[PDB]
Design a protein around this ligand. Structure first.
Ligand SMILES: CC(C)=CCC/C(C)=C/CC/C(C)=C/COP(=O)(O)OP(=O)(O)O
Ligand SMILES: CC(C)=CCC/C(C)=C/CC/C(C)=C/COP(=O)(O)OP(=O)(O)O
Ligand SMILES: C=C(C)CCSP(=O)(O)OP(=O)(O)O
Ligand SMILES: [Mg+2]
Ligand SMILES: [Mg+2]
Lengths: 313, 326
């Protein structure tokens, strides 16, 4: 019973080798050092929109609660990021689960503190859609992965639902009408779709900080985005190239050549502009005001619908 | 008039209600979310049982549907924990069946849980009562605080009855107390009556856990060693052991070194044996069980026979929670 024969010494060792616990329990301090350092924390794009929207609607404790929704939204965003990191593929995805749950529980806590069940419903739906989108991203009929309509549903759940429902939440907290609320929702929904679509293009285009030659992150990892989906309508031969990207990694470069002879990038950007225009229409349709701060915010919101398209970063 | 049988059919109604409530396309998300809600794999539905009985106990089917909601939300919250719990605590078994983290993977388990939480908030919103939203949000915060304590605390912290008492409340009794309070609040009972419903849930929950911790050691039969000892094998340190450490300090290094040397399981049982640990744990549980019964006793007098029958069964659980042979 070999293990039984040397238990004495095993425990001396097992004990000693708890030098990694104890000593080195701090020097989590790396964790704190790493968090500050990151490359962000965030650009605060969702927060910017939400604070602007709060101002952009005619109506302190209210401004405190409105910011409450920007706070909740960030909490919900990071929790979804973390849970999406939970790997099936040492594994660190116990950290992601615990941290995600702390943020979600804090979100619930803060939703409860708003004392508005209608906004609770909106962020509840937001959470459900994020979860739905991620399931869609992971599981999928091979056929499904190649449908532009499916991609756009998935894109809506993953990227636009959180922001649309938050924009609507800000409307509802501010006591706006059902018809104004549906405007703020539509601003977020449409701006969000545009933002993601521009993100998809930037992966292939690159950036000024980029080489400047796209990182190609999506296509390396078999994530199929709008430009490539559009390019497959033109070149059916491309379906085969994209499939064989893992098997043979030079199929990335070949995919790139197809895209460059196609209207894929153009068609994704034209779709983004269509969405961004619709967002600016939503602000345009907002009830007339005389307030200068309010009108300044609405101009900003509309400005954001232009800057989202022309992003080089 | 038996409390489980007295509520059994509404539990099946709730059971089926949960199934549509948890339904979702995408289908893969549906498989995951529904997994612990089908006939046979719902668990013993003790939280629901207490809630339906409590619902009747407080009284005067327009409002009952709302009260049922609380049991459904509570069950959804509950199952959400388990799913997340199984990814942590790295299980392969739950409810006599493959756990979701083995069957469907870690990712689906965690998404299913988030899904169930959001449906729970959804249903909480639909009830349009802000105090009820806050009561169940507290419960969710408490679950996370409690799960975190069971993991995170340093060694010196974990080995006191104070710590155990807090962790148990957050991890186990908070869901029962707050949902008990919510049921009461939904009926627009005075603030004081809501507290009575809260003290009941709180004390019954704490008493249930104490007895469960003892049964790990004793088992079906009364004496020591018949039980599975699953907690102490894995290095979970429940009340019997903690009380024993009050008598025998040297037991701390023994229990702390259990994982490394599984022969330290036997040494700990010898220490438990000489101690009054099992006994004091029981004595604590009997004290909680008392306060629970006492709370129901302070409820306002009623004429209704169906109410009395239901009040008597909540008390019956007060005795049964101590008595449970298993
Ligand atoms: C729903 C959602 C996620 C919406 C996005 C919100 C939004 C439009 C954020 C701002 C984007 C922006 C101004 C980028 C600047 O890049 P740049 O290269 O244009 O820098 P520059 O404008 O200073 O030249
Ligand atoms: C709302 C949500 C998703 C919260 C996450 C926090 C979390 C994982 C809580 C777990 C609470 C719980 C029921 C523990 C019991 O499991 P046990 O291991 O003590 O005993 P058991 O596995 O046999 O139930
Ligand atoms: C505090 C309680 C009454 C707990 C019992 S819940 P428990 O996890 O034991 O039971 P299930 O739902 O069957 O898994
Ligand atoms: Mg477990
Ligand atoms: Mg646990």
């Amino acid at each position: 019973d070999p293990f039984s024969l040397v238990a004495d010494e095993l425990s001396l060792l097992s004990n000693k080798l708890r030098e990694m616990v104890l000593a080195e329990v701090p020097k989590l301090a790396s964790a704190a050092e790493y968090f500050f350092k990151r490359g962000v924390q965030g650009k605060q794009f969702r927060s910017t929109i939400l604070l602007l929207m709060a101002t952009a609607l005619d109506v302190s404790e209210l401004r405190v609660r409105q910011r409450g929704i920007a706070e909740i939204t960030e909490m919900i965003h990071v929790a979804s990021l973390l849970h999406d990191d939970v790997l099936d593929d040492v594994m660190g995805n116990k950290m992601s689960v615990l941290a995600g749950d702390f943020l979600l529980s804090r979100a619930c806590g803060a939703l409860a503190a708003l004392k508005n069940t209608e906004v609770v419903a909106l962020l509840a739906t937001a959470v459900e859609h994020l979860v739905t989108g991620e399931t869609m991203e992971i599981t999928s009929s091979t056929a499904a992965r190649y449908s532009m309509d499916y991609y756009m549903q998935k894109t809506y759940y993953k990227t636009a639902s959180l922001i649309s429902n938050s924009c609507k939440a800000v409307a509802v907290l501010t006591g706006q009408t059902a018809e104004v609320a549906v405007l703020a929702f539509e601003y977020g929904r449409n701006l969000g779709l545009a933002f993601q679509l521009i993100d998809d293009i930037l992966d292939f285009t690159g950036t000024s900080a980029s080489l400047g030659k796209g990182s190609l992150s999506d296509i390396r990892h078999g994530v199929i985005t709008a430009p490539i989906l559009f390019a497959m309508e033109e070149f059916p031969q491309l379906r085969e190239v994209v499939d064989q990207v893992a098997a043979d990694p030079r199929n990335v470069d070949i995919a790139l050549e197809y895209l460059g002879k196609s209207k894929g990038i153009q068609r994704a950007r034209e779709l983004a502009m269509e969405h961004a225009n619709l967002a600016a229409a939503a602000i345009g349709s907002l009830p007339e005001t005389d307030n200068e701060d309010v009108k300044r915010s609405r101009r900003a919101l509309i400005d954001l619908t232009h800057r989202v398209i022309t992003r080089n970063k």
